[PDB]
Amino acid sequence: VTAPPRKVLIISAGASHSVALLSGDIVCSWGRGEDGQLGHGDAEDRPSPTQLSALDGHQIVSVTCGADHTVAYSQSGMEVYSWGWGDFGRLGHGNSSDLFTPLPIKALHGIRIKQIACGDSHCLAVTMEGEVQSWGRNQNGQLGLGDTEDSLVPQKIQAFEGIRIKMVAAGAEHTAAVTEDGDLYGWGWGRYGNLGLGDRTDRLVPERVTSTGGEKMSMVACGWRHTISVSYSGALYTYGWSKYGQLGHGDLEDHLIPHKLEALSNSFISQISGGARHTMALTSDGKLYGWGWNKFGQVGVGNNLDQCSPVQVRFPDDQKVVQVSCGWRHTLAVTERNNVFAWGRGTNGQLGIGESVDRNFPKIIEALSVDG
Amino acid sequence: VTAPPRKVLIISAGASHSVALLSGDIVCSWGRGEDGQLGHGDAEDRPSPTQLSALDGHQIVSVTCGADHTVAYSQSGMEVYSWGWGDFGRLGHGNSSDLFTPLPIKALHGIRIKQIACGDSHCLAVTMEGEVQSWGRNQNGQLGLGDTEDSLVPQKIQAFEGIRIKMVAAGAEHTAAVTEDGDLYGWGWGRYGNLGLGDRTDRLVPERVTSTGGEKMSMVACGWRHTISVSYSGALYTYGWSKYGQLGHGDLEDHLIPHKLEALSNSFISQISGGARHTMALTSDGKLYGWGWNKFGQVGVGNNLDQCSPVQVRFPDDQKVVQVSCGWRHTLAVTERNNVFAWGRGTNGQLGIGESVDRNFPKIIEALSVDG
């Protein structure tokens, strides 16, 4: 009998593409291919998951999408790879060349990497020791280096000296982080209140968010112009832009400091993802809630109407969700049954279900899933 | 017999879409439709020219594409319309809502408009009196208003008081202008020397280019990060980014001040267009030269190799070219026979030739042309 599908370990949504890491250290990618973000050498869209052969045997343990580029890394080889749109040095190679196949980021060779975050035009790496390096576009201070000059190679954020960083997140042109001891930071473009600092002004270095209720934060994620964080008590906070209701507070008003999403106060949140104009949160018992822009069905609730308060995304037999990732106009999810689902815009093939119309509720990706 | 095709009056290329104005005041659009830039109400790509019915009978005399939006105006009704991606107020309506159908820009109602220029995320209008108003993204000073705050509505550039502006041009995040008396200006994002001011620094208000040889400039155009101008003697100057050879000086070096393109010194240049990473120039006797990025065939010279020096684009029977417009990955041209040709990337339908592979030399658009 044909071997069971590989376990789906990681999913990541870019703006119009999708990438997964499967057991056996196998990378696959699908969706928009025009900027090289799929990494298969050509520039064509792929409507079904396509194995990225160039990374076979390279012991990849992680993948992360930016808007129109992709990063992956190997812990054993201590190598980070990047490919896709090259403008402003977002790929980190000391130039701005686009890449249609993965190349190792030489500046990160031999570094012990804990996490990579990618925004639209900048990226950040966290080391096992909690140090942070950033690269790419810096016009609004998003690299946190204290100026506004783009960096074509990774540079250490000296502002975090002596501060152990747990994780970072990046939006279009802003950045956030949480420390191992629960403090929350924001920097970069801040015009819609998305740094959580109480104003609409950029920051060129990380600045600590002081309005958190004395609550410590365990995690943070960014959408295009909004930010989401979760406290040690599982409470969900959002801040920044809510033009499309993506903050989830029942209206379309921006927030300049973190604001607890009251409607979810009785659920413990375990994972979060920000899309361009929508948001996902996953509870500890595997229920997925979505909200925000829904023009293309990306909220996954069976219609095409924007949602300004959380709505539960439903799956067959109520199977629990274990991973979620948001793109510009689509959403990906993995369930406890080792099924992968996708919904939203499908014109670039990003749903991974073969040629298809857009979908407004979850659709199974047969190529990756146990069930049909 | 079926009436002759309408005369093609204006062509304009956006990043991944294409728009034309035809005799009888008819607007048609094709290519990528996802952000609303085609203006037909839906979000779908159109691979053939599609009449924009909503503007029928509105006496449109001009159309101009930005990256992912479109502007048109009527001289008789003194109305300017915009549609497409709404972020940062590039559409000029006092909000940042996307539009999938044209809406009039109320702030420009009853104003006598001479010209509209659109970049990626900002736009400018020149009045019949040579005044300039700008709107949209302003993070690097590209609106020329003296600060870095986005403007959701048009605002007058007070810096040009008493200076009669002939025309303006806009790139990704920079802007240029020529005065009626031949002076050249640049402002906005300047990191690749593209303002022509001798450095890599932004300007928040227009600044005059002083290295022009005492030559007066009759016209200016912008690509993504480069700028092109033509003198009263028909000499061609380029400056800014030349990573892809788009300045046309035989190598890949940036220029911080205008540099005359020596290879074309024996031709008189009459029209110019900048694409994202390629360039077009049209001589007074109707010969079209292209150069720069050619990955998708957009230079139109029968291959997919970048060109760092001008190469003549050839047409059937050497019919003269009368109009040209460059997009992100495609190029449009109109000839003296009232034929329209397109070449380059075709995945969004932007070539207007029905479903098609990419093309590396000119292909006739049957729907608009006299010939087959």
Coordinates of C-alpha atoms in Angstrom, one line a residue, chain A residues 16 32-35 41 43-45 85-88 95-98 100 137 139-140 148-150 152 173 189 191-192 200 202 224-225 241 243-244 277 293 295-296 328-329 345 347-348 350 358, chain B residues 16 32-35 41 43-45 85-88 95-98 100 137 139-140 148-150 152 173 189 191-192 200 202 224-225 241 243-244 277 293 295-296 328-329 345 347-348 350 358:
Chain A
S16 CA -0.2 35.1 -3.1
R32 CA 2.1 32.9 -7.5
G33 CA 5.5 32.2 -9.0
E34 CA 6.1 35.4 -10.9
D35 CA 8.7 36.9 -8.6
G41 CA 13.6 28.0 -11.3
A43 CA 8.4 32.1 -13.0
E44 CA 5.1 30.3 -13.4
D45 CA 2.2 29.9 -11.0
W85 CA 11.7 39.3 -5.1
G86 CA 15.0 41.0 -4.3
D87 CA 14.2 44.7 -4.0
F88 CA 15.7 46.6 -1.1
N95 CA 22.6 42.9 -3.3
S96 CA 19.0 43.4 -4.6
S97 CA 18.9 40.6 -7.2
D98 CA 15.7 38.5 -7.4
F100 CA 14.2 32.0 -8.7
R137 CA 13.8 47.9 3.6
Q139 CA 12.7 53.6 5.2
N140 CA 10.5 53.9 8.3
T148 CA 16.3 54.9 7.8
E149 CA 18.8 53.3 5.4
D150 CA 18.1 49.9 3.7
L152 CA 21.2 44.5 2.1
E173 CA 6.7 48.0 7.1
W189 CA 6.1 52.5 10.3
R191 CA 0.9 55.8 11.1
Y192 CA -2.2 53.7 12.0
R200 CA 0.9 57.5 15.1
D202 CA 7.3 55.8 13.6
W224 CA -0.2 44.4 6.9
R225 CA -0.9 47.4 9.2
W241 CA -5.7 49.5 11.5
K243 CA -10.6 49.7 8.4
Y244 CA -11.8 46.1 7.4
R277 CA -6.6 42.8 6.1
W293 CA -11.7 41.5 5.1
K295 CA -14.1 40.0 -0.2
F296 CA -12.5 36.9 -1.5
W328 CA -3.1 38.7 1.4
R329 CA -6.3 37.2 0.2
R345 CA -8.6 33.9 -3.4
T347 CA -6.5 33.0 -9.1
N348 CA -2.7 32.4 -8.6
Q350 CA -2.5 29.6 -3.9
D358 CA -12.2 31.3 -5.2
Chain B
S16 CA 0.0 44.5 -14.9
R32 CA -4.9 42.3 -14.1
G33 CA -8.3 43.1 -12.4
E34 CA -7.7 41.9 -8.9
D35 CA -7.4 45.4 -7.2
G41 CA -17.1 46.1 -11.1
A43 CA -12.1 41.6 -9.7
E44 CA -11.2 39.4 -12.6
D45 CA -8.4 39.6 -15.2
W85 CA -6.2 49.9 -5.1
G86 CA -7.0 52.5 -2.5
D87 CA -4.2 52.3 0.1
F88 CA -2.6 55.6 1.3
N95 CA -10.3 57.8 2.4
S96 CA -8.3 54.7 1.5
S97 CA -11.1 52.5 0.1
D98 CA -10.4 50.4 -3.0
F100 CA -13.9 48.6 -8.6
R137 CA 1.6 58.2 -0.2
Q139 CA 6.5 58.8 3.3
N140 CA 9.5 60.0 1.4
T148 CA 6.1 63.1 5.2
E149 CA 2.4 62.6 5.9
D150 CA 0.2 60.8 3.4
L152 CA -5.9 61.3 1.2
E173 CA 8.0 56.9 -4.7
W189 CA 12.6 59.0 -2.5
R191 CA 18.2 56.6 -2.7
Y192 CA 19.4 55.5 -6.1
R200 CA 21.3 59.8 -2.7
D202 CA 15.3 62.4 -0.4
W224 CA 10.2 52.6 -10.9
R225 CA 13.6 54.0 -9.7
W241 CA 19.0 53.1 -11.0
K243 CA 20.8 47.6 -12.1
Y244 CA 19.0 46.2 -15.2
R277 CA 13.1 48.1 -14.9
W293 CA 15.1 44.3 -18.1
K295 CA 13.3 38.6 -18.6
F296 CA 9.7 38.5 -19.9
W328 CA 6.1 46.4 -14.9
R329 CA 6.7 43.5 -17.3
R345 CA 4.5 39.3 -19.8
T347 CA -0.1 36.0 -17.5
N348 CA -2.6 38.6 -16.3
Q350 CA -2.2 42.5 -20.1
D358 CA 4.5 35.7 -22.9

